[PDB]
Structures are given as structure tokens and as C-alpha cells.
């Protein structure tokens, strides 16, 4: 009964952390910056995912006695978490790149509606990548396993296509945007006497960029291994490397551990935000 205890502990820790972050952020409403709104949406996604942990805690001891709509919602939330995180991080990185390099501000002089509608757009575009998860993921009942685990029903031919779509889009595209934007930020920031036209704004911009880059590094480090495992599964399905049972019993536990890391990131984010951002705790308590 180690897994239910661990799931409950993570549920409590993540709930407390993300609730505190969201409460302190919404306390000073109608005065947030673009990065503050993006981090608020990341916190919303993280708390929305960690809100499903007690269901898996119950499933770890007793079978999945929950129905099918709950299963669909849980799978959709798990996928939406790592879709929205990557896309919102790419948006914030592009904003930082523009501000550092071209000295142009989109979300500052423009209305807050400019960032509100891009947040709505990324939310909708993430829902429209998890619609296939809604179409599938019913609760089954297999032989030799007297349980109702959550699995997929659609044909194996479609599994490869969906996996390729998820991997390609939600890993390659944000990764390319990240690499380009951050390479240019580092090039234009390691050799400049004074960003903008003053010094206080220079150091403020440096601090904000440092916070953004540490958040991005944490997210990438937590979520990359799962995508590597999915890539390995995709290649072994096509025929590049063999489907030996000794190569399947290992990718199963690899998937389990990497999904656990993806779940732990949702509670790792707020304490990282508070420790590095000491000023955040100053305005919190």
C-alpha cells in the first residue's frame, strides 16, 4: 500500500502549493503582467491535473470503480497538462525573445485582452488535441485480471498515428521555438552594455528572464523522459527495432516512472517558484 500513500502525499502537497500560488496571484487582480498570467495558467493546469490523484489512489488498492466519464476526464487531463505546459512555455519564451532582441512589447502597451485571448486560444487548441482521448478511453474488464483498468479501444493502426501526432507536435514544435528564441536571447544578452535605455529596467529584465529560464528548464527536465519513452514505443511499433518481450516489460515500467515524474512536476513547480523567487514569498507572507 505504498502507492496510495504516495499519491495522497503528492495530492496534499500539490493542492496546498498550487492553491497558495493561485490565491496570491488572484489577490492582485487586474494588475498582472504577461508572465504572471502565463504562470497563473500553468498553475491552473497543474492543480487541475493533481485534483485527480485521489482517484488513482483508490484505483491502486481497489479496482477502478468510477465509471467511464471519469476515466475519459482523467486521461484528457493528463494529456492536456503536458500540452498546455509546453505551448504556454513556448509563448512566454517568444515574448521574452521579442522583448530582449527587438525591443518590442506586445502584452505591455497592448490591452490585457491580448494575452487573455492567446491563453484562451492555447486552451482551445489543447482541448482539440485531447478530443481523440474523449472519443476513446472506456473502462474495460479483461480476462485473467478481475479489474476494470483504464485502457484504449481504437485500432492499433490509429495508435501509431495519434502517438506520432502527439510526439511530433507537442515535443518538436515547442522545442524548436525554445531553441531558436533562447539561442537568440543568449547571443543578444551576453554582449550588450545596457539593455533598454536605463539600468533598473535592465536588471529587472535580467531577473525576469532568469526566472522564466529556470521554470522552462524544470519543466523540460521533468517531462522529456516520457516523450523519449513514447518515441521508443513508436519506433518499436513501426519496425526499426524489435518487439521482444524483454524490450516491452522494460518500457512498461519506464512509462510508469516517467508518468510519475510528470505528476511530481505539478507539485515541484510552486516550491521552486517560491525558493528562487524570494520576492514572491515577500508578497505572499
Amino acid at each position, epitope marked *: 500500500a505504498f502507492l496510495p500513500a504516495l499519491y495522497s502525499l503528492l495530492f496534499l502537497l500539490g493542492l496546498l502549493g498550487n492553491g497558495a500560488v493561485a490565491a496570491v496571484l488572484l489577490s492582485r487582480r487586474t494588475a498582472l503582467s504577461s508572465t504572471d498570467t502565463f504562470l497563473l495558467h500553468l498553475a491552473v493546469a497543474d492543480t487541475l491535473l493533481v485534483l485527480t490523484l485521489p482517484l488513482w489512489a483508490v484505483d491502486a488498492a481497489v479496482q477502478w470503480v468510477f465509471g467511464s466519464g471519469l476515466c475519459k476526464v482523467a486521461g484528457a487531463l493528463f494529456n492536456i497538462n503536458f500540452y498546455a505546459g509546453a505551448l504556454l512555455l513556448a509563448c512566454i519564451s517568444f515574448d521574452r525573445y521579442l522583448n530582449i532582441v527587438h525591443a518590442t512589447q506586445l502584452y505591455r502597451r497592448g490591452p490585457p485582452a491580448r494575452v487573455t485571448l492567446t491563453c484562451l486560444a492555447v486552451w482551445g487548441l489543447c482541448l482539440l488535441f485531447a478530443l481523440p482521448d474523449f472519443i476513446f478511453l472506456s473502462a474495460h474488464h479483461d480476462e485473467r485480471l478481475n479489474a476494470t483498468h483504464c485502457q484504449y479501444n481504437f485500432p492499433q493502426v490509429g495508435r501509431t498515428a495519434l502517438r506520432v501526432l502527439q510526439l511530433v507536435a507537442g515535443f518538436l514544435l515547442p522545442l524548436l521555438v525554445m531553441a531558436y528564441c533562447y539561442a537568440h536571447i543568449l547571443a543578444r*544578452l*551576453k*554582449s550588450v*552594455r*545596457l539593455l533598454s535605455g536605463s*539600468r533598473e529596467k*535592465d*536588471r529587472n529584465l*535580467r*531577473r525576469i*528572464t*532568469r526566472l522564466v529560464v529556470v521554470v522552462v528548464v524544470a519543466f523540460a527536465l521533468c517531462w522529456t523522459p516520457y516523450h523519449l519513452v513514447v518515441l521508443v514505443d513508436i519506433l518499436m511499433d513501426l519496425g526499426a527495432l524489435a518487439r521482444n518481450c524483454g524490450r516491452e516489460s522494460r518500457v512498461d515500467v519506464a512509462k510508469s516512472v516517467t508518468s510519475g515524474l510528470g505528476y511530481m512536476h505539478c507539485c515541484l513547480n510552486p516550491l521552486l517558484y517560491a525558493f528562487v523567487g524570494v520576492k514572491f514569498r515577500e508578497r505572499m507572507w
Partner: nanobody
Amino acid sequence: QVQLQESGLRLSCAASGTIFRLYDMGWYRVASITSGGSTKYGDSVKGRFTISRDNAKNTVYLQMSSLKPEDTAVYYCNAEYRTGIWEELLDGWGQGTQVTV
């Protein structure tokens, strides 16, 4: 922090410590050379002095010729530097030098 030690008729100012980059240098009592090599002087100086920079050793020099009694003063070296890539640009002064004729 970092230090800035001067010398004694040639003025050589050096910097040492944990510096990510040096940006500006000069002498005060009038002459300032940037990191790119551009040199600036006062509007009343018609090329009497000359300033050169050696970025490899992080040293700034000041060459003075045709000295006059009106130049007898105390001269301090100044430098701008950043201690890290994420840090703030800040400047430090030197102890100073005394010219006795």
C-alpha cells in the same frame, strides 16, 4: 567585489577579480575608451592626450605629452563591469595617483 590598482610618467590601470565583462574605462581629475575601442576626450583637448586599451589583460592606459603645471592634480581610474550574466551593471573607483613635478 573586484579591485582596481593603478600605477605611477605613464598611467596603467588594471582590474582583477570575478568579472564577467568589462565595458567602460577612463581617467578622471577627461578621457574614456569603450569596449569597442572608441575614444572620447574633452571639447578643450585638441589631441594632446591619447588613451589605449588592452582588452586581453583588462588594462587601460593614458599617454600624456607636453605636460603643463595646470595638470598637477590627483587622477582616479574608473571601470564598469558586470559580475554575472544575470546581474546589474555597476562601476568601481580606484585609490588614485599623485603626480609630483
